[PDB]
Design a protein around this ligand. Sequence first.
Ligand SMILES: Cc1ccccc1-n1c(=O)c2c(C)c(C(=O)c3c(C)nn(C)c3O)ccc2n(C)c1=O
Ligand SMILES: Cc1ccccc1-n1c(=O)c2c(C)c(C(=O)c3c(C)nn(C)c3O)ccc2n(C)c1=O
Ligand SMILES: [Co+2]
Ligand SMILES: [Co+2]
Lengths: 382, 382
Amino acid sequence: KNPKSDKFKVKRFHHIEFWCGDATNVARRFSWGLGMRFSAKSDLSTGNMVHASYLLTSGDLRFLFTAPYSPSLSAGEIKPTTTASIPSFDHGSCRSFFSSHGLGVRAVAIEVEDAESAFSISVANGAIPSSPPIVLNEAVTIAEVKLYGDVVLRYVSYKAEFLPGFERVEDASSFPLDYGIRRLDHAVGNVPELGPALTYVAGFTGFHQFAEFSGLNSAVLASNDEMVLLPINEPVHGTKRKSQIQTYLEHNEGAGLQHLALMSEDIFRTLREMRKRSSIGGFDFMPSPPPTYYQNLKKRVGDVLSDDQIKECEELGILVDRDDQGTLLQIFTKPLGDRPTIFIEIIQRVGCMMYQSGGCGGFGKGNFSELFKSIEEYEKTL
Amino acid sequence: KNPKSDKFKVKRFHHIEFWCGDATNVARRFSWGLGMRFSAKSDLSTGNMVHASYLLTSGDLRFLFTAPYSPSLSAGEIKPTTTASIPSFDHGSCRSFFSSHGLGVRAVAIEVEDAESAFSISVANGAIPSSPPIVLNEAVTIAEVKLYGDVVLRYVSYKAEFLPGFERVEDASSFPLDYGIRRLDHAVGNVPELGPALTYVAGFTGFHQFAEFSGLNSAVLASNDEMVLLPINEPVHGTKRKSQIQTYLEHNEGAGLQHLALMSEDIFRTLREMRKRSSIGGFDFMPSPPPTYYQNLKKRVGDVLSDDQIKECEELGILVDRDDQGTLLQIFTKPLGDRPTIFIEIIQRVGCMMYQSGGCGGFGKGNFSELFKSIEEYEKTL
Ligand SMILES: Cc1ccccc1-n1c(=O)c2c(C)c(C(=O)c3c(C)nn(C)c3O)ccc2n(C)c1=O
Ligand SMILES: Cc1ccccc1-n1c(=O)c2c(C)c(C(=O)c3c(C)nn(C)c3O)ccc2n(C)c1=O
Ligand SMILES: [Co+2]
Ligand SMILES: [Co+2]
């Protein structure tokens, strides 16, 4: 059931911003590892004396990487005179964020009809303000409220390219990399207590619980058309294997963004390209499930995937799960940086045509049982 | 003239350590951009709860990338019980270094006969102690003294692989990249005042001035066999073009390491490989000199380089300079990170055979006049 109770008009995910120590090196690593193009910048060369911000794009997916310059470069500025292109940026906040959490997501940005109204309505409905609505060049409005931990939900609205003050990147510096990633499917937070997290966010957005069908309890919040999907997890304590949600909280110094799920228009091509680059600057993937898992896929999705398409999942280490409505193909990277905290999921969904509905096939929770069973079965092959 | 006045026995450059916010992303970017292999690690997977350190190698060149974990992981430790593999590491120092300077070199490490003796003699001769000699697994001794700004000169000595507590990297994660870089040729510091810098370092090392033949004054300190080369620059104020040394000091928040010169056994192959990767995660190079500069190379080095080898310099943007003793081929990257501070020089020297003597061909200061003249000449072609 979908009560369509969004308290303001929400459009789509707009971008994800990472707070970095050095935005150049993270952005270049991510660009090569994920096949994302350099498309905009805001830095010293554009007159920004406060922060360096570099935007990567793949299809509709936008990754922003920001790091502070020396505060001495902007010591004469005040907010009315700032050269920052993102007026919510603060040297002290950014340094404290990164020292506390390491590399990670600071902002989950969604495009809304009216960022001022969304901010007002959100805070009137319990949201903790983080940055008030600011109108940029009478063209775009940005505002921020707290989501969980030190992560903010950023609202952006456009009267009618990324943000004012950003410059398009010269073609020579903009190699047209593309491994097939096209948009952000969902963004997942880890918290110590799921109940209060859910009630807070569902409180100020009006997002509703999206229906499903180890070591965690989880729930998914969704916008009216269920295109914005914000799952949240809490750990389950006492298990024989320590909860990965608890390990995240310990190494992250508390709540924060756990994984970003990126939709590919061709998950086979995406994984082939990403795996060729794993050991030459790109991203590593979690261990592949045992061949038993792939021997068990025929009985589960053999009506959706050919044996040749099932063989390709096996070569690439892809997992498969299924709802009553659609099928999901997914795989997880190892952590993106030093700490066992944030990682990336690559996904592709099949089914639920009308365009495709959001969350088609679920999020893969059925793979816990399938993996465990596959692992006992591989142990029995022995 | 070489008075061979080293106060302790110095062998070779051993490694360069960068202090990072995220060592994983910088190390992966550098590995792909420079063609360096992942060869050792010290991190959570090796029992280090304090810092993540990843070592890249190309030939004899060793780049170490280190970032701190959350202090909470090691809050119960004391120095006698530490899990850090580099006992000089300190969370607070590393965070303050990176927040102050951004990404840059913390340690210039040289292998010495006896790190305890080198540290003792250095401090007895004016060096500011940074970290006392520590013996690791009764196998290697490390000690550190201040070099300039927040950069330390690190001594390492071996009784008889990198450091104890580091683990060799699994072959699967160790792709054998190689673009021809083989060793560190020199490491250059920028300071506000050259005189006191030179006197301090020459004071405690016994390193002597190495003889030569805009916007800077410079001098080179060398070890007995002149294989360790530590140039230092200060700005020249008042020039019509602002000194790049002064720009460095402003953005770096003071003195620090300006450039690392990496010797290639085949600078043509190195530059071809690095330039193919500039826009797909690697390093960018400074603008190429005008074709006039290459039309002027025949008259200057036409006895050393074929016209086909001179054409290859032109395709790759390589600069050429010459001493009374040897010839130098060199090129400079754009800054390695967000700030216009540290950059890399790729070099190859020809001449001075006996093995090759250090500094063969100088350091390229003759290219200031050659570039300027070439630029006026290209303007005249018009
Ligand atoms: C626990 C663990 C330790 C080490 C290596 C992998 C894993 N591991 C996963 O991490 C995992 C994730 C993140 C999702 C996910 O993407 C998700 C969930 C669940 N709920 N929602 C809303 C999502 O988006 C779905 C299945 C997963 N399986 C089966 C699994 O084994
Ligand atoms: C100033 C500047 C602004 C923007 C773009 C490039 C440049 N630029 C250089 O940066 C430069 C360097 C660093 C060296 C060097 O490597 C060095 C020196 C000098 N002394 N020692 C001991 C060295 O090792 C040699 C020649 C150079 N030329 C000719 C030049 O134009
Ligand atoms: Co997911
Ligand atoms: Co040089």
